[PDB]
CSV table of C-alpha atoms in Angstrom, one decimal:
chain,number,residue,atom,x,y,z
A,1,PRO,CA,58.0,-23.0,26.6
A,2,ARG,CA,55.2,-23.1,24.8
A,3,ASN,CA,54.3,-19.4,23.1
A,4,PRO,CA,51.6,-18.7,23.6
A,5,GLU,CA,50.7,-20.9,26.5
A,6,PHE,CA,47.4,-22.0,25.7
A,7,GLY,CA,45.5,-22.0,22.1
A,8,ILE,CA,46.4,-22.3,18.7
A,9,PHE,CA,49.5,-20.8,17.2
A,10,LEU,CA,48.0,-17.2,16.0
A,11,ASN,CA,50.9,-16.1,14.4
A,12,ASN,CA,51.2,-18.8,12.2
A,13,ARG,CA,48.0,-18.9,11.3
A,14,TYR,CA,48.6,-15.3,9.8
A,15,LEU,CA,51.9,-15.8,8.5
A,16,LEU,CA,51.5,-19.1,7.2
A,17,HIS,CA,47.8,-19.1,6.2
A,18,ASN,CA,46.4,-15.4,5.7
A,19,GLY,CA,44.1,-15.7,9.0
A,20,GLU,CA,42.1,-18.6,7.1
A,21,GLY,CA,39.3,-19.6,9.3
A,22,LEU,CA,39.5,-16.9,11.7
A,23,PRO,CA,36.7,-14.2,11.6
A,24,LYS,CA,37.1,-10.9,8.8
A,25,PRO,CA,38.6,-7.8,10.8
A,26,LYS,CA,36.7,-4.9,12.6
A,27,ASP,CA,38.5,-1.6,12.9
A,28,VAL,CA,40.1,-1.0,16.9
A,29,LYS,CA,38.0,2.6,16.8
A,30,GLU,CA,34.7,0.8,17.1
A,31,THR,CA,35.9,-0.6,20.4
A,32,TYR,CA,36.2,2.7,21.6
A,33,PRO,CA,34.2,5.7,20.0
A,34,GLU,CA,34.6,7.9,23.0
A,35,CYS,CA,38.4,7.8,23.1
A,36,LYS,CA,39.1,10.8,21.2
A,37,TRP,CA,41.6,13.3,21.0
A,38,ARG,CA,40.3,16.2,23.5
A,39,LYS,CA,41.9,18.8,25.7
A,40,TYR,CA,42.4,18.9,29.4
A,41,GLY,CA,44.6,21.1,30.3
A,42,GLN,CA,46.6,19.6,27.2
A,43,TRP,CA,45.3,17.3,24.1
A,44,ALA,CA,45.4,14.2,24.6
A,45,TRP,CA,43.6,10.7,24.0
A,46,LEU,CA,40.7,11.4,26.8
A,47,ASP,CA,36.9,9.8,27.2
A,48,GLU,CA,34.3,11.7,27.6
A,49,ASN,CA,34.9,12.0,31.1
A,50,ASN,CA,38.3,13.3,30.6
A,51,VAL,CA,40.1,9.9,31.9
A,52,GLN,CA,42.6,9.0,29.8
A,53,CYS,CA,42.5,6.2,27.4
A,54,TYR,CA,43.9,3.8,24.6
A,55,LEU,CA,43.2,1.0,22.7
A,56,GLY,CA,44.2,-2.7,22.3
A,57,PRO,CA,44.0,-4.0,18.5
A,58,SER,CA,43.6,-7.6,18.5
A,59,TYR,CA,43.8,-10.1,15.5
A,60,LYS,CA,39.4,-9.3,15.6
A,61,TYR,CA,39.9,-5.7,15.8
A,62,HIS,CA,42.9,-4.5,13.6
A,63,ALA,CA,44.4,-0.8,13.9
A,64,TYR,CA,44.4,0.7,10.8
A,65,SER,CA,47.3,3.8,11.3
A,66,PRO,CA,49.1,6.1,9.4
A,67,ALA,CA,52.8,5.4,9.1
A,68,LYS,CA,56.1,7.1,8.4
A,69,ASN,CA,59.5,5.4,8.4
A,70,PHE,CA,61.9,5.2,11.6
A,71,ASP,CA,65.9,4.2,12.2
A,72,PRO,CA,65.4,1.1,14.6
A,73,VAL,CA,68.8,1.0,15.4
A,74,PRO,CA,69.2,4.5,18.2
A,75,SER,CA,65.6,3.4,19.3
A,76,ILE,CA,67.1,-0.1,20.4
A,77,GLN,CA,69.7,1.6,22.3
A,78,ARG,CA,68.6,4.7,23.4
A,79,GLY,CA,64.7,4.9,22.8
A,80,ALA,CA,61.7,4.6,25.0
A,81,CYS,CA,62.2,0.6,25.1
A,82,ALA,CA,65.8,0.3,25.3
A,83,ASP,CA,65.7,-0.3,29.1
A,84,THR,CA,63.0,-3.1,29.0
A,85,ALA,CA,64.0,-6.9,29.9
A,86,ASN,CA,64.1,-8.6,26.8
A,87,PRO,CA,60.3,-11.0,27.0
A,88,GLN,CA,60.2,-14.8,25.7
A,89,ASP,CA,61.0,-15.2,22.0
A,90,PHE,CA,62.7,-11.8,21.5
A,91,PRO,CA,65.2,-11.7,18.9
A,92,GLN,CA,69.2,-11.4,19.5
A,93,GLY,CA,70.4,-8.0,17.6
A,94,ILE,CA,68.0,-6.1,15.7
A,95,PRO,CA,64.4,-7.6,14.9
A,96,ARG,CA,64.0,-7.9,11.4
A,97,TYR,CA,60.9,-6.2,11.8
A,98,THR,CA,60.1,-3.2,14.0
A,99,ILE,CA,57.5,-0.7,14.6
A,100,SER,CA,56.9,2.7,17.2
A,101,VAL,CA,53.5,3.1,18.5
A,102,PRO,CA,51.4,6.6,19.9
A,103,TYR,CA,50.2,6.8,23.1
A,104,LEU,CA,46.5,6.0,21.8
A,105,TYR,CA,48.1,2.2,22.0
A,106,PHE,CA,49.9,2.5,26.0
A,107,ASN,CA,49.9,3.7,29.4
A,108,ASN,CA,53.6,4.9,29.7
A,109,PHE,CA,53.5,3.6,33.5
A,110,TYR,CA,52.3,0.6,33.8
A,111,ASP,CA,51.2,-0.7,29.8
A,112,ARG,CA,53.9,0.2,27.8
A,113,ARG,CA,53.8,-2.2,25.1
A,114,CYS,CA,57.7,-2.2,24.6
A,115,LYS,CA,59.2,-5.5,23.1
A,116,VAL,CA,55.7,-6.9,22.4
A,117,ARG,CA,54.6,-8.8,19.0
A,118,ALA,CA,52.5,-7.1,16.4
A,119,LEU,CA,51.1,-8.7,13.1
A,120,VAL,CA,51.7,-5.9,10.2
A,121,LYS,CA,49.9,-6.8,6.7
A,122,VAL,CA,52.0,-5.9,3.5
A,123,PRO,CA,49.5,-5.8,0.9
A,124,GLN,CA,49.8,-6.7,-2.5
A,125,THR,CA,52.1,-4.3,-4.5
A,126,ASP,CA,54.1,-4.9,-8.5
A,127,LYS,CA,56.9,-6.4,-5.9
A,128,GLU,CA,54.8,-8.0,-3.2
A,129,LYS,CA,52.4,-10.5,-2.7
A,130,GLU,CA,49.9,-9.9,-0.1
A,131,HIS,CA,51.2,-11.7,3.3
A,132,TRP,CA,51.4,-10.4,7.0
A,133,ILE,CA,55.0,-10.1,9.0
A,134,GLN,CA,55.8,-10.4,12.7
A,135,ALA,CA,57.0,-7.4,13.9
A,136,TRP,CA,58.1,-6.0,17.3
A,137,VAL,CA,57.3,-2.8,18.8
A,138,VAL,CA,60.7,-1.2,19.7
A,139,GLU,CA,59.5,2.4,20.5
A,140,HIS,CA,57.1,4.9,21.4
A,141,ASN,CA,56.4,8.2,18.9
A,142,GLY,CA,54.6,11.5,18.5
A,143,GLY,CA,52.6,10.4,15.5
A,144,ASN,CA,51.1,13.7,15.1
A,145,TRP,CA,50.7,12.9,11.0
A,146,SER,CA,48.0,11.3,8.7
A,147,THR,CA,48.0,9.8,5.0
A,148,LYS,CA,47.7,13.4,3.8
A,149,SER,CA,49.9,15.3,6.1
A,150,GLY,CA,53.2,14.4,7.9
A,151,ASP,CA,52.8,17.3,10.4
A,152,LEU,CA,49.5,17.8,12.1
A,153,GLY,CA,51.2,20.9,14.1
A,154,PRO,CA,52.6,20.4,17.8
A,155,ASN,CA,48.8,19.9,19.1
A,156,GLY,CA,47.4,17.6,16.7
A,157,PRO,CA,46.4,14.3,17.3
A,158,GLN,CA,48.5,11.7,17.7
A,159,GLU,CA,47.2,8.1,16.0
A,160,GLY,CA,50.6,7.5,13.6
A,161,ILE,CA,53.1,4.6,13.8
A,162,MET,CA,56.6,4.3,12.6
A,163,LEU,CA,57.6,1.5,10.5
A,164,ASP,CA,61.4,0.6,10.4
A,165,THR,CA,63.2,1.6,7.0
A,166,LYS,CA,63.5,-1.8,5.4
A,167,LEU,CA,59.7,-2.4,6.1
A,168,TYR,CA,58.4,0.7,4.8
A,169,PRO,CA,59.3,0.8,1.1
A,170,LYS,CA,57.3,-2.9,1.0
A,171,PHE,CA,54.4,-0.5,1.4
A,172,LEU,CA,55.1,1.3,-2.4
A,173,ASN,CA,54.7,0.3,-5.9
A,174,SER,CA,57.0,1.2,-8.7
A,175,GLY,CA,55.1,4.2,-8.9
A,176,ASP,CA,56.8,8.7,-1.3
A,177,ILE,CA,55.9,12.2,0.8
A,178,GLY,CA,57.2,10.7,4.2
A,179,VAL,CA,54.0,9.1,5.3
A,180,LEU,CA,52.7,6.1,2.9
A,181,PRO,CA,49.4,6.9,1.3
A,182,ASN,CA,47.2,4.4,2.6
A,183,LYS,CA,46.9,3.4,6.2
A,184,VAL,CA,48.8,0.3,7.4
A,185,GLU,CA,46.9,-2.6,9.0
A,186,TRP,CA,48.3,-4.2,12.4
A,187,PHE,CA,47.8,-5.7,15.9
A,188,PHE,CA,48.7,-6.6,18.9
A,189,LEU,CA,49.6,-10.3,18.2
A,190,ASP,CA,48.9,-11.4,22.0
A,191,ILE,CA,46.4,-8.8,23.1
A,192,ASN,CA,42.9,-10.7,22.9
A,193,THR,CA,40.9,-8.9,25.1
A,194,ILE,CA,37.5,-7.4,23.4
A,195,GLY,CA,34.8,-9.6,22.2
B,1,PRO,CA,55.7,13.4,37.3
B,2,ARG,CA,52.1,13.5,37.3
B,3,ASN,CA,50.0,10.2,37.5
B,4,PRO,CA,48.1,9.6,35.4
B,5,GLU,CA,49.6,11.8,32.8
B,6,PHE,CA,46.7,13.1,31.3
B,7,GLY,CA,42.7,13.5,32.3
B,8,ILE,CA,41.4,13.4,35.7
B,9,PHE,CA,42.9,11.9,39.1
B,10,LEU,CA,40.2,8.8,38.5
B,11,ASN,CA,41.6,7.3,42.0
B,12,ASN,CA,40.7,10.7,43.5
B,13,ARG,CA,37.1,10.7,42.0
B,14,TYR,CA,36.6,6.8,43.8
B,15,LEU,CA,38.5,7.1,46.8
B,16,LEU,CA,37.3,10.7,47.6
B,17,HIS,CA,34.1,10.9,45.8
B,18,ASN,CA,32.3,7.2,45.5
B,19,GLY,CA,32.6,7.3,41.8
B,20,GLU,CA,30.4,10.3,41.4
B,21,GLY,CA,29.7,11.7,38.0
B,22,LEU,CA,30.9,9.2,36.3
B,23,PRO,CA,28.8,6.4,34.5
B,24,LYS,CA,27.0,3.5,36.4
B,25,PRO,CA,29.4,0.2,35.9
B,26,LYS,CA,29.0,-2.7,33.8
B,27,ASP,CA,30.1,-6.2,33.9
B,28,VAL,CA,33.4,-6.7,32.4
B,29,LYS,CA,32.4,-10.3,31.2
B,30,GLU,CA,30.1,-8.6,28.7
B,31,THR,CA,33.4,-7.1,26.8
B,32,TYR,CA,34.0,-10.6,25.8
B,33,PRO,CA,31.4,-13.0,26.0
B,34,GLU,CA,33.2,-15.9,24.1
B,35,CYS,CA,36.4,-15.7,26.3
B,36,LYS,CA,35.3,-19.0,28.1
B,37,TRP,CA,36.8,-22.0,30.1
B,38,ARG,CA,37.7,-24.6,27.3
B,39,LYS,CA,39.6,-27.6,26.5
B,40,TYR,CA,42.2,-27.0,24.2
B,41,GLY,CA,44.9,-30.0,25.0
B,42,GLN,CA,44.5,-28.0,28.4
B,43,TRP,CA,41.5,-26.4,30.0
B,44,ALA,CA,42.1,-22.3,29.3
B,45,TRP,CA,40.6,-19.2,29.1
B,46,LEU,CA,40.1,-19.5,25.1
B,47,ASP,CA,38.0,-17.6,22.5
B,48,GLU,CA,35.6,-19.4,19.8
B,49,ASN,CA,38.7,-19.9,17.9
B,50,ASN,CA,40.6,-21.1,20.7
B,51,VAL,CA,42.9,-18.3,20.9
B,52,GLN,CA,43.9,-17.2,24.2
B,53,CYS,CA,41.9,-14.5,25.8
B,54,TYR,CA,42.0,-12.4,28.7
B,55,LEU,CA,40.1,-9.5,30.1
B,56,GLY,CA,40.4,-5.7,31.0
B,57,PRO,CA,38.3,-4.6,33.5
B,58,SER,CA,38.0,-0.5,33.7
B,59,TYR,CA,35.9,2.2,35.7
B,60,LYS,CA,33.4,1.4,33.0
B,61,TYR,CA,33.2,-2.5,33.2
B,62,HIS,CA,34.0,-3.8,36.9
B,63,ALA,CA,35.2,-7.3,37.7
B,64,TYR,CA,33.2,-9.3,40.1
B,65,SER,CA,35.0,-12.2,41.4
B,66,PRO,CA,35.3,-14.9,44.0
B,67,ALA,CA,38.1,-14.3,46.3
B,68,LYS,CA,39.9,-15.8,48.8
B,69,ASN,CA,42.8,-14.6,51.3
B,70,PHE,CA,46.6,-14.6,51.0
B,71,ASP,CA,49.5,-13.4,52.9
B,72,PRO,CA,51.2,-10.8,50.5
B,73,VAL,CA,54.9,-11.1,52.5
B,74,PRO,CA,56.1,-14.5,50.4
B,75,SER,CA,54.3,-13.3,47.4
B,76,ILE,CA,56.5,-9.7,47.5
B,77,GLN,CA,59.6,-11.8,48.1
B,78,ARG,CA,59.2,-15.0,45.6
B,79,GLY,CA,55.9,-14.7,44.0
B,80,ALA,CA,54.9,-14.3,40.4
B,81,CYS,CA,55.6,-10.5,40.7
B,82,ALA,CA,58.9,-10.7,42.7
B,83,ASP,CA,61.2,-9.5,39.9
B,84,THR,CA,58.9,-6.9,38.5
B,85,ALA,CA,60.6,-3.4,38.5
B,86,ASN,CA,59.0,-1.1,41.0
B,87,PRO,CA,56.9,1.0,39.1
B,88,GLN,CA,56.1,4.9,39.3
B,89,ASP,CA,54.1,5.5,42.5
B,90,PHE,CA,54.8,1.6,43.9
B,91,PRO,CA,55.1,1.8,47.8
B,92,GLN,CA,58.0,1.3,50.1
B,93,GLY,CA,57.6,-1.9,51.7
B,94,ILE,CA,54.4,-4.1,51.7
B,95,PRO,CA,51.5,-2.1,50.6
B,96,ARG,CA,48.5,-1.8,52.4
B,97,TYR,CA,46.2,-3.5,50.4
B,98,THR,CA,47.2,-5.9,47.9
B,99,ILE,CA,45.5,-8.7,45.7
B,100,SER,CA,46.4,-11.9,43.5
B,101,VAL,CA,44.6,-12.1,40.1
B,102,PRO,CA,44.3,-15.5,37.5
B,103,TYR,CA,44.9,-15.7,34.2
B,104,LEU,CA,41.5,-14.9,33.4
B,105,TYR,CA,43.2,-11.0,33.8
B,106,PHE,CA,46.8,-11.2,32.3
B,107,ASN,CA,49.0,-12.8,29.7
B,108,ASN,CA,52.3,-14.1,31.4
B,109,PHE,CA,55.0,-13.4,28.7
B,110,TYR,CA,53.9,-9.8,27.8
B,111,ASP,CA,51.2,-8.2,29.8
B,112,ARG,CA,51.6,-9.8,33.5
B,113,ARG,CA,49.9,-7.0,35.0
B,114,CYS,CA,52.3,-7.4,37.8
B,115,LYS,CA,52.7,-3.9,40.7
B,116,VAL,CA,49.7,-2.3,39.1
B,117,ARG,CA,47.0,-0.5,40.7
B,118,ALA,CA,43.5,-1.6,41.3
B,119,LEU,CA,40.3,-0.2,43.1
B,120,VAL,CA,38.6,-2.4,45.4
B,121,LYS,CA,35.4,-1.8,46.4
B,122,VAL,CA,34.3,-2.6,50.1
B,123,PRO,CA,30.4,-2.5,50.5
B,124,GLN,CA,28.5,-1.6,53.9
B,125,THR,CA,28.7,-3.8,56.8
B,126,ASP,CA,28.1,-3.6,60.3
B,127,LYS,CA,31.9,-2.4,60.9
B,128,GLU,CA,32.4,-0.7,57.5
B,129,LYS,CA,30.8,2.5,55.6
B,130,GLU,CA,30.8,1.6,51.9
B,131,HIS,CA,34.0,2.8,50.3
B,132,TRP,CA,36.7,2.2,47.7
B,133,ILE,CA,40.1,1.2,48.4
B,134,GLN,CA,43.6,1.4,46.4
B,135,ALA,CA,45.2,-1.8,46.0
B,136,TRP,CA,48.4,-3.3,44.1
B,137,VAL,CA,48.2,-6.5,41.9
B,138,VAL,CA,51.3,-8.2,43.6
B,139,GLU,CA,50.6,-12.1,42.6
B,140,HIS,CA,48.7,-14.4,40.4
B,141,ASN,CA,47.2,-17.6,41.4
B,142,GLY,CA,45.3,-20.3,40.1
B,143,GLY,CA,41.9,-19.3,41.5
B,144,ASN,CA,40.2,-22.4,40.6
B,145,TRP,CA,37.0,-21.4,43.3
B,146,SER,CA,33.4,-19.9,43.4
B,147,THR,CA,31.7,-18.1,46.1
B,148,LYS,CA,30.2,-21.6,46.8
B,149,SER,CA,33.3,-23.8,46.5
B,150,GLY,CA,36.8,-23.4,47.8
B,151,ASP,CA,38.1,-26.0,45.3
B,152,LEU,CA,36.1,-26.7,41.9
B,153,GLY,CA,38.7,-29.4,40.7
B,154,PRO,CA,41.9,-29.2,39.2
B,155,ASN,CA,40.4,-28.4,35.5
B,156,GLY,CA,38.2,-26.3,36.9
B,157,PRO,CA,37.5,-22.6,35.8
B,158,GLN,CA,40.2,-19.5,36.8
B,159,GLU,CA,38.0,-17.0,37.8
B,160,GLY,CA,38.8,-16.3,41.4
B,161,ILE,CA,41.3,-13.9,42.8
B,162,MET,CA,42.7,-13.0,46.6
B,163,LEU,CA,43.0,-10.5,48.6
B,164,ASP,CA,45.6,-9.8,51.6
B,165,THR,CA,44.7,-11.4,54.9
B,166,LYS,CA,44.1,-7.8,56.0
B,167,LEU,CA,41.9,-6.8,53.4
B,168,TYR,CA,39.3,-9.8,53.4
B,169,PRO,CA,38.0,-9.7,56.8
B,170,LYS,CA,36.5,-6.0,55.8
B,171,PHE,CA,34.0,-8.1,53.2
B,172,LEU,CA,32.6,-10.2,56.5
B,173,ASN,CA,30.1,-9.0,59.1
B,174,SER,CA,29.9,-9.8,62.7
B,175,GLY,CA,27.8,-12.8,61.5
B,176,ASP,CA,34.0,-17.4,56.7
B,177,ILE,CA,34.3,-20.5,54.7
B,178,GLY,CA,37.6,-19.6,52.8
B,179,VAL,CA,35.5,-17.8,50.0
B,180,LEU,CA,33.9,-14.7,50.6
B,181,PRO,CA,30.0,-15.2,50.4
B,182,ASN,CA,29.5,-12.3,47.7
B,183,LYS,CA,31.9,-11.3,44.9
B,184,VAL,CA,34.3,-8.8,45.2
B,185,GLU,CA,34.1,-5.6,42.8
B,186,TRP,CA,37.1,-4.3,41.3
B,187,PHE,CA,39.0,-3.1,38.2
B,188,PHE,CA,42.6,-1.8,36.7
B,189,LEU,CA,42.7,1.8,37.9
B,190,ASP,CA,44.9,2.6,34.5
B,191,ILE,CA,43.3,0.3,32.1
B,192,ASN,CA,40.4,2.1,30.3
B,193,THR,CA,40.5,0.7,26.9
B,194,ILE,CA,36.5,-0.4,26.1
B,195,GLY,CA,33.8,2.0,25.3
């Protein structure tokens, strides 16, 4: 069946045409300024009324996230998404590009965002031309890291993502602390819900 | 386990306290004005770049939808959500209140919103005090109706929802064309993603 069911092939516009003809991105943080790291008994992503909140980066509102690497094989076998049914167009075997996301981007009971498509921007480096890739979310993680620190403490903000071990080094020049020095730009391919 | 995992019990604030202490609602249509009924080969919910789009009404941005009734028993058995795994806190048997939603509110491959919680406002009538109820989404529908017409034609806009046959009559006074005369106010309980 056609995927997406309606409209343009958004993945092709990025992978083959770099986003040409589409608006320049805004940051998904601007969609929900009041969704912050706050304490209500425990530290969590909460709004100004102490209601759980999460974000939905789209092709219009990209996420810019501090990133570590991870091994996708144990995640696929026994991680947070291991019992999720394979959705439309999911690869056989280990997908070429995989990511893990923190609680800033899901609800763990009802909107888990397991085995969904994400586009990730790979900037120019000494090795790589600038280009977009398509990855699958295959894990959830804590994500208490920033571009300056691999560990913000047990209760520190949970913004960080993970990239598979073969995608991560594409972000580096030939010139690594365990978090990439620049935030990684990405969005959920099939989530276009904010104007 | 605690549900929601973090933050206040949002359902209790509506069901027991009518939303007290929370902001007055805005319309979810204002979150995405450019998500419109448009033709790209077929008629669909599409943005200004012909990308598929959908909405996520929350406690801050309610949906106001034209509503028909439906029989939840065949939907539970063999409708769009019949093979969805029962999530946390899903009832045994037929839930007391059930709704069906159109494509304006889901992606059918990756964000189906099957077996999720919705709060629905039941206004005062000659029989009912004003109050909120908690319903489960158990079906998807076409929804080519408005408060003035049960049938907007094969290609007409798909905004309409359905309410189970025992919830629907709670919207009427003792004073029915098949669509309720007033739009029904509702939101997804666990989706709080737009500021």
